Amino acid sequence: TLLINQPQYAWLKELGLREENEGVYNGSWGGRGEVITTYCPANNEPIARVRQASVADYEETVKKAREAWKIWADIPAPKRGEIVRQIGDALREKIQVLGSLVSLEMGKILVEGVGEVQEYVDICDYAVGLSRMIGGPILPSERSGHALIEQWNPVGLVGIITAFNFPVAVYGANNAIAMICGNVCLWKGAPTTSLISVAVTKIIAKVLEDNKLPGAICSLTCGGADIGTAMAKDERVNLLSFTGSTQVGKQVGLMVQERFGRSLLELGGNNAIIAFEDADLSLVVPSALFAAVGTAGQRCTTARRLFIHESIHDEVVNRLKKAYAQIRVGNPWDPNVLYGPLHTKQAVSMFLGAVEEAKKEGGTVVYGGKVMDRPGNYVEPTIVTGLGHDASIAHTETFAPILYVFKFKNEEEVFAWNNEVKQGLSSSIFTKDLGRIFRWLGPKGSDCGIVNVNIPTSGAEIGGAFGGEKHTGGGRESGSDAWKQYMRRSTCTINYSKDLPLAQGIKF
Amino acid sequence: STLLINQPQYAWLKELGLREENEGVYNGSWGGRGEVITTYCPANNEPIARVRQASVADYEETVKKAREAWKIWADIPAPKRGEIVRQIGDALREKIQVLGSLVSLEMGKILVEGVGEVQEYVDICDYAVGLSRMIGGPILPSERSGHALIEQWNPVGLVGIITAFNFPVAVYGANNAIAMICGNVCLWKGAPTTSLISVAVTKIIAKVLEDNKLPGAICSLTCGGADIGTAMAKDERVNLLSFTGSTQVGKQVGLMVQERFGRSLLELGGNNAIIAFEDADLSLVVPSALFAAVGTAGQRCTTARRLFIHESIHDEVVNRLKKAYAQIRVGNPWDPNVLYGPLHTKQAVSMFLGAVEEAKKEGGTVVYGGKVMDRPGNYVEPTIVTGLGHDASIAHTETFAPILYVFKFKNEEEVFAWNNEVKQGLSSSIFTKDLGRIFRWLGPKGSDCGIVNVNIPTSGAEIGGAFGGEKHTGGGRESGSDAWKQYMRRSTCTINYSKDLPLAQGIKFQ
Amino acid sequence: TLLINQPQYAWLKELGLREENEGVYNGSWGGRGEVITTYCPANNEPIARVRQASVADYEETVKKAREAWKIWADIPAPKRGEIVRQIGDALREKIQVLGSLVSLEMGKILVEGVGEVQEYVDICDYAVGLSRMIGGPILPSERSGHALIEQWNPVGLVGIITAFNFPVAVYGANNAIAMICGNVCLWKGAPTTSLISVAVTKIIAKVLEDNKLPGAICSLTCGGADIGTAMAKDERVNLLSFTGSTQVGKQVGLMVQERFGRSLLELGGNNAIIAFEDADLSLVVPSALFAAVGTAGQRCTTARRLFIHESIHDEVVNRLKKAYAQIRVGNPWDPNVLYGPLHTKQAVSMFLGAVEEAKKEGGTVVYGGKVMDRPGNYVEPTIVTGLGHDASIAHTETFAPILYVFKFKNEEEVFAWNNEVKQGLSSSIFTKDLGRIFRWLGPKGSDCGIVNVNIPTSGAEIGGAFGGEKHTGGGRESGSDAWKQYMRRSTCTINYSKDLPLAQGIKFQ
Amino acid sequence: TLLINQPQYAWLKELGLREENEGVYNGSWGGRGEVITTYCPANNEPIARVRQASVADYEETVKKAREAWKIWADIPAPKRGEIVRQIGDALREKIQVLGSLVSLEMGKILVEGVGEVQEYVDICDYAVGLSRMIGGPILPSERSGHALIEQWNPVGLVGIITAFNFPVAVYGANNAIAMICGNVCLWKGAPTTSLISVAVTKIIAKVLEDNKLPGAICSLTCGGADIGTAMAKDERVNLLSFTGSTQVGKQVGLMVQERFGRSLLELGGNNAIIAFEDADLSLVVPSALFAAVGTAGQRCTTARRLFIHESIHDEVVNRLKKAYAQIRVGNPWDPNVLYGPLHTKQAVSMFLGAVEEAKKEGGTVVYGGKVMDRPGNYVEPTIVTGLGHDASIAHTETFAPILYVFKFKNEEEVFAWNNEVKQGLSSSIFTKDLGRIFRWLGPKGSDCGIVNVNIPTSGAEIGGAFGGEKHTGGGRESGSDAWKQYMRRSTCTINYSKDLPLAQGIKF
C-alpha cells in the first residue's frame, strides 16, 4: 500500500525513513499534531506518513532552540564552519538517494533532484570559507585615542519557511549561512514535502549529535499555515526567512513588521526572456525550452514571458514548437525523462483554468494546453501567442508550464514591458549588441534582482546573492554579502584615552 | 514688528533668503497652496516667520517633477553626481554660522550644536564625494566557462525623506548626500515646527542645482504635516522612504510601505543606557553622562536616559553629577557659551512635568531639578531621579525631556540584560577598564543596540560608520560604511559570452 | 633675457615665482646646490632659475620630514583628509595659471596642462573620502575569547621621484594618497620641470602653514641623479615611489631591495592599439590619433604600436594620414593648438635616429619623419608601415611621436604580439565581438596593467589603480586599494580571556 | 640500516615511500641529479633516499608546467576550488602518517607534525570559499557609456621554495591559494626534508590524476641551491615565493628584481615578548615557554627576546626556570613528549657558540645551556639573563632554543627596543592597559607584521595574512587578501557607446 512498504522503493530506508515518521526535531524527535500522508505526484500513491507539530510542540521547540543558541553563539565562527563542512560531507554521502526522494515526493526529474542536493553541498563549502571571513571594517576615527569598528553578531533564532518546489536547496542556503553566522534555525517546510524535510533534518541531527552539540541548533517543526503564522508573529523568531507565494509572503512581511522583527522574503516571479533581432537563435530556442519547461514550469525563476522581435517571432515560435514536441514525458526518476508531473492536483486545476482564461482573453494555444490522460498530475507544456503584453492572465503568476509569447520592435518599449509587472525576480535578454547589454545592466535597464545576458532566467550559481525586487520581496540568499541579513551590525567606538573630544569638534 | 524676522536684531535671518512669508514647496519652482504655518522661537515664545505648506495638488505635482528629473539625473555618472554634492558641501561651509544660528533660533539647541549639526552634513558631503568613485559590486568568478558574473548596483528612483524636529538639518543631509551620489532624486518633508530650517536648507541646495543647469526637483521639498507623510508612505512612486521620528508613527509607516512592497529605512526612538562599572574612570563618567543627558536639553534620539552605576560608586557619581548639573550656564541658545537651552515646545514642558510626577508616583526621588525654570521660553531644569527599579514604567518611556533615571547594579551579566530589556535598541555605552568585559560587551552576549560604545557617551556619532538601531528603533542605517546600499537595488548578472550554454550545478538537460 | 622678466609672462608671479627660486623646502626655503636654468621648449628661451639641493640640504630635509612625521602620524586620518581637501581647493584656485606653467616649461598644450592639474584636484577629492575609510577587516578568530584584526599604519617617509612628462599629476596622486595614509613626503622632480615642482610646493606649503602644520610634511629637494640615487639608498626613505625610465627604474628597484625597503615602480610602456575587422572605424581613427600624438607622443601610455586587421589596414592607414595632416601645430599655450614641441633638444635627436633606424630595418615612412623648420623642438608626428611585429626599433621605447603600424589576421596571434614586449603598461582593442572582448579581459588576453576596449591607451580616470606589469615595474597609483602600498599591514590577535587556546588545536602541555 | 627497510617503520609505505624515491614530478616521476640520503635527527640514522633534479629535469619540468597552465587557467575558479577541496580531503586521510613523517624526518613532536598538516587542511577549506570570491570591484566611470572594472588573472607559474622547519604547511599555504587563483606551481623544498616533499607531492598527484588534470599543475623538483638559484633567475617563474634565511632571501629578491619578476619573501624573525607590570603572570609564563621552546626553538616566529618590567623580572624568571625544568624531552614520536632534537648537528654547533658568546658578553645562563648526552641533536632549552637589550649575541638569529631576558622600565623605550632589530615578523605584549594596547597596535607601536596582545609570538591562524616587515621581506601568505600576490591586476575601461569623452574633460 504505502510505497515505503514496497521493495521497488526500499532505498527510502537508507534515509532512515519508515512508515510513520516524527516531524518535530529539537534534539528529541516527536510530533503531537495531525499525521499527514504525502503522495507521489507521478502516480498519486501514498509514500509514508509524518507526525506534524502541535502548537505545544512548536512552543517547546522555540524554547529549546533559544537555549541551544547560548552554547552555539559561543562557538568561534571557524569552528561553526567545521560543523557545516561535516553537514556538506553527510549530504555527499546520501546525494543519490536524497535526490531520488526529491524526485519521488516533489516530482522533479532525477538530475534536478540530485542537482538541488549539490546546490546545498556547494553552499556548505562556500560557508566554510565565509566562516573565516565574516565581519566588518576597522575604520579611522576622526578622534584621537579612539577606535571605530563595525561588528557583526548573530540575530539569534532564524525561522526558515520553505516551499514545495525547492524542498532541499532553499533551506540549505538559509541554514548553512545562518549557522556560520552563529544563529540557530527552526524549519517549517511545505507539508507536501514533509518526508524530504525529515530526511534532511535526520542528516543534520546526526552531525550535531556526533559533535555533542544540542540538536535544537537545527530544529524542525513540520506543519501547515498555523505553524507558519505562529512563526511570523513570534517575537522570539529574530529573523524569518520566507520563501513562498507573493500573497502569503505579503502577510508574513506585515506580521513581522508589526512586531519590529526582521524578515527575508523570497516571493514569486513573472520572468521574461527577450530575443532581439541579432540574437543567436541556436542559443535562444533551447534556452527558452529549458527555462520554460524545466521543473514542469514550477520554478520561481521559470521563464513565463517570451518577447521576440517582430522579424524573428514566427521563426522562433515554429522552432520552439518542434522542440516541445520532442520533450520526453514520464516518471521523474526514470533516467530518460525530461518532464515529470506537476506537484499537486490543485496545480493541474489552476493550469487548466489559466489556459482557458488565456483563450478568453484572446490568446491562441499554439502548443499543448491539455491535461494529460494518465495517473498523476501531468499536463502538457504550453505556448500561448497573440495576447497583449498587459493581458491580465499574463501578469498573473500561475505555477504551471504556460509560456506567453509577445512581439516587440524597439528596445525601449520591451525594457519597459519587462519591468511593468509587479514581480521582480529574474530577467534575460539575448543579443550581441554591446551597447544594449550594458543598458540592460544599467539604471534604465531591467529592474529585477537577476539580470542575465544570453542565458535563461533560471539556474543561478551560489557565488552571487539570490533574490528579487518589488513583489518578489527584497530578500537575498547565498552569496556575496547576503550573510549580513542573518546578523546585526553594530557601530562601535572605543575611547582608550584619558580625554573626551566630541565628534564634529563640538566644544561642550 | 511681532515677527522676529521683522526685528533688526534678527536681520541675519535674511542672509538665508528667508522673508516674512516663505514658499514651502520646491520642485524646480517655489510654491505652496496649502496651509500657512507660523513657526515660533522656543527661547522666547515669539513668532519668527511663516511658511506656506504643500497642498495635495502640490505633492502630486512635485512627485511627478522629481520622477521626470530622475530620468536626467540617473544618466549622470556617479563621479559627476559627486561633484554636485561637493558643491553642496561648499555651500554649507559658506553659510555654516548663520545656518547653525537659525537651527538655534527655530529648534532651540545651543550654537555649538547647531553649527555642529551643519558640520555633520558637510562631513557627509565630503564622504559621499569619494564614495561617488567607489559604489558598486564585485566581479565574481563564475563556475561556468565563458561566462562573467557581476554584481551591479543601480538607483531605486525617488527617495522620500521624512525628518523630525530635533535634527532638522543633519538627518536630511545624511540621507540626501548619499541618495544623490547613488543616482536617486529626493523628496523632503520636515517637521512643521522647523519649516524655516527646511526652506533655508533647500534654498542652499536649489541654487547649486540651478547653477549647474540641473532640474531642481532632484532635491524636492514639500513642507507639511502628517497628511503629507502618510501620502509618501502610501505612494508607490516613492521607491524608498527614509523616516526619522517617533516609534509609534514609524511603525505605521513601515506597515504602509510593506503593504505596497516598497522599501523603508526606519530611524525611531532610543532609550539609551550608560553603564559605569566599579573600575571606571569617574573623570570620564561624569562629563560623559552630563553631555549625553543634558546635551540638546535631552531631546536627542541618542540622549542617555538610563544611568546604571555599580553599587560601590553610585552615591559618589550621583553627587558629582549633581554638582556638575548646577554649573550649567543657561540662556538663549544662539548666544555663544550658553550650554543649556529650552525644550522645543510648550507641550514638551508639560510632558516634562508629567514624567517627573509619574516618576514620583512610581517611587523615585528627584535629587536634582524637576521644575520648570522661572524665565521666558520653554525652559526646564535638567533632572536626576534615583530609587526606581530598572523595570519601572516611567523608565520604559521615551520622553524628549532632560530626565535621567539612575539605577544601581552589582553584576555584569544582569546589567547587560537590563541594557537589552527595553524595546528600543539605538545606542549604549559602558565605562570600564576591563579588557574582557569590553570585548564581551561588543560580542554576541553583549549590547543588542546599533551603537555600542566604550568610555564615551551614547550621543554624538561621527559620520564614517553606519548610524541606526535595532529592535523598535526600526533597523535602518544612514551615513557611513555600506549604508549606501539601502539607496540602491542589487542585481546579480550572468553574461554568457560563449557559443555554449552549460547549466549551474552541472545539470544536463538534453 | 629670462621669460619671467618679460611683461607677457608676468602671470608667472601669481605662482610666487621669481628670477631665481629656492628649490629646497622643508618648512623653510633654501638650496645650496647647483643653480639650474629651465627653458621653454617652444622657443628654447630661458624661463627662470632654481637653486637645487646640496647633500647637506638633503640630509637636513630628510631629518626634518621624519621629525614632522611624529606630529603628522598622530593626526586622525579624517583630519589629514581635511588638509588634502584644502590642497584640492588651493589647486582649483590656481588651475589656469598652473596649467600655463606646465605648458611653458614642459610643453604640452594648455588643455592637457589644465587637465593634468584637474587629475590632482580629482584625486584630492577621492582621498578625502578615503581618509574616512582606510583600514582592514575584523576577522573571526578560531579561538574563543580572542579578537583578530587587520591594522594598517603609515610606513613613514615616502620619497617621490617623478618625470618630465607629467610634472604635476604623478606627484599629486602619490601625495594625496600618502598624506591621508599618515606619511610625510619628499619630492624630487625632473630637473627640466623644476619651476613646476617649486610652484606646486609653494601651493602645498601655504596650506600646511595656514593649518599650523610643519611644512616638512611635504618636503621638496630639487636635484638630478645624485639626489635620486641618495633616495634609493637611504634607509630613512621607507617607500620610494619612482616614475621614470625602465633603465633607471631597474637600478632604483635593486638599490631599494638591497636595503629591504619598499619601492613603487612606474616605468615605461610600449602600448598597442588593436583594430579588428568589425571595429567602428569612426572610433578607431580619432582614438588612434589622440593616443599617438597627444602630448607629442611623450606619455608613458602613448600608443606606439597599431595593429590593424588585414582587411581594413589600408583604409585605416589612409584615414589616419588624412587625420594627421589636419593637426594644428603651434605654441602650446595658444588657442586650438593640438600639437606642441618635444620636451628637449636631445629628444629631437632621438626622434631622428629612430626614424633612420626604422628605414634601415625595412620600414616605410608614410607620413612625417622630419624635424619642422621652426623655433623650438618641433618634429612631425610620424607613421611607419611595413615593419614586422618583432622589428628591433618597434620593441624599443622611444619618447617620440612615431607610430608603428602592423597587419594581423587572427585574434590569438595578435593578442600574443601585444604581450610579446618587455613592457606591460597599457593596451586597447577595438571590436564589437562580445566573446573577443571577454577573452581580451581574461587569462589568455592582455597581460597589461591597463586593458581597454573601444578607447585609446592613454587618459585614465582616477577611480582605478594605475600602473603596469613586467618591465613597467608593478606599482600602482591613485585608485582602488593602491593606498595599501603606502602603509604596513599587521595581523593582530588579542586575547581578552583568561585562557590560551593554541592555533590548529595544538595541545602543548 | 635504512629505517624504511626496518619493519618497525613499515608505516612509511602508506605514503608511497620506498628505499629510493623519485624527487622530480611533472606528471611523471623521475630524477637524474644526485641521490640524497636524509637522516632522522633524533638518532642520526638514515631513513631513505631521494633522486634529486638535474638541470635537465628542471628545464623539462618548467616547460611541462607552463603547458599545463594553458589548460588549468581555462578551468573556472570554483572548479579549481573543487580540486583543492579534494586535496584537503586527501590530506585528512593521511594526516597521522604524514604527521609522523614530519616528526621522523624533520624532528618536531607529533602533535605539531599533525597540527602542521592541519594548517594545510584548513587553508584548503579557506581557499575553496575564496575560489567563489576572488576578483575586483566594478567601479562607476566618470564617462557616460563606459564601464570600469578591476580584473584579476593568474600570473602563470608560481615557484615555491620552502625551508626545513615547516616542510608541509608553508608549501600548502602557497599551493592552495596559488591553485584557486589559476596558477601552476613548482616546489623546491629543503634537501633535508626531501622525503616529506615527495610524500606531499604523491598525495596531490593522485588527486590531479583522478581528476584527469595534468600533474605538472603541482610540479616538484627536489634539489639544493643550484635549483633554487635557477628558479630565482628564470623568467618563466612569474612569481617566486621564498621562505628561508634572510641572507639567502635578500639575494633571491635581488635576482628576481633584476628580471622584473615577482617575489614573495618570508624570512627570519627576532621576535619579542614584553610583559608589563600589570600583566597576568599566569598567562605570561606558559606563553613564554611555548613560544620559546616550541619546535625546539626552530620557528621563524619563535620568541627569542623576553622583556620583563623591572618590578616582576625576578619572579617571572624564577617561575620560568621552575617550568623549563618540567619540559619533557624524548623522541618526537614518543607519547607525552614536549621537546625533540634540533634538525641538524650544525644547529647544535650554532647553539653552543651562541651560549658561549652570551656568557662572554656578560650573560648568566639561569637554565640549560648544554648539549644533552644522548643520540641525536638534542640541546637543553636555555634562558639567559643579564644582557643589555643591544647585546651583540641577542641580535643574531640563532635557530635554537635560547631565550634572552631583559629588563625595562617604561613603555616608550621597550616599544623602541622591540623595533630596533633588523627583522620584523612577530611581537607580543602582555598587559591589561587599554591605552597601552591600542598604542601598541597603532603607528607608534610594534613595527612587525604580527602584533599580538596576551598571546605569544607564534601559532597564528590561517584567516589572516601571515608575514613580516623590514628584513623579514614583506611577503604575506594565507588569509585576508594575500591571494592578490598570486594574480595580476588590470584596470579595464569598456566603451559601449559611439562617443569618445576623454578623462578629466580634455577636449582635443
Ligand SMILES: O=C(O)c1ccccn1
Ligand atoms: O549620534 C547622534 O547623536 C546622532 C548622529 C546622527 C544624526 C542625529 N544624532
